[PDB]
Amino acid sequence: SSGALIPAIYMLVFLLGTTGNGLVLWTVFRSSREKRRSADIFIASLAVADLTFVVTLPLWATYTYRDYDWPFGTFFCKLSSYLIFVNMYASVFCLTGLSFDRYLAIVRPVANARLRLRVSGAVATAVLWVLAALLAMPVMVLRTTGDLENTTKVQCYMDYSMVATVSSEWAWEVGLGVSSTTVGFVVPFTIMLTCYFFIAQTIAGHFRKERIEGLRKRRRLLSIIVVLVVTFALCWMPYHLVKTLYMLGSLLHWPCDFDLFLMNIFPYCTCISYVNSCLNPFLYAFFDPRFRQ
């Protein structure tokens, strides 16, 4: 299109993300033993997801310089695609995970804490970590390599074989798209919304007195609630939004000019998604007054 030589933003974005997640992991490794209060295991999981979500893309950054070619064989992109694809599920998993324990703890402490040693007792974390891999299994072998259709340049396109009836394969792509879109959207957004609303109601009930010292604390806490809810409630959809629009406009007439805008804007939602990962550590680790030394 009009734009060219895109990865200028990508190098700096991945530099910032690598610096942030490396700092987070270095601090957590420099920290002490299990005495970490209630969420540092989740924070470490998020940090390692950020790491092995941002590590490997510079190859695709130099791709456009070395365009229409793969130098490392099929298996390399086989593993890279799965590694990147699992992480976007990992984020939507251990974000609701990081919110659920706080929701349990800050609603009714007298009634709660009964399931603290049951769900959070090294039980929910493992299943949350492995569910992403369990649902990313269907793409163990789906992206074999070929020379496009006529132009003899290698790329490991998503394999279109899916040996079945003619219409079954198309059903396969539409299912793997729609289910992927819905799973990380419909439910988890509801958990975060309802839990944050409940926490806001409880904290409003607790801080009835408008003390001068309490004014700053309450304003800060409410602002933190707002920013954490709004970042995920805005800047995570656009990739799913644009791909759902792709399917919808394939179904509808949706003229070829709109095809052109969809195609040339599709690279943008990439970075509009990576911003979530690069901002999560700044959102969470930085606000801590300890700042992990």
């Binding site: 695709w60 456009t64 992206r143 396109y157 690279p267």
Partner: peptide
């Protein structure tokens, strides 16, 4: 031009 979804899994996509 009339190209058939070559950005779908080639250029820089993870669908």
């Amino acid at each position: 031009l009339q190209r058939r979804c070559m950005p779908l899994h080639s250029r820089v996509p993870f669908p």
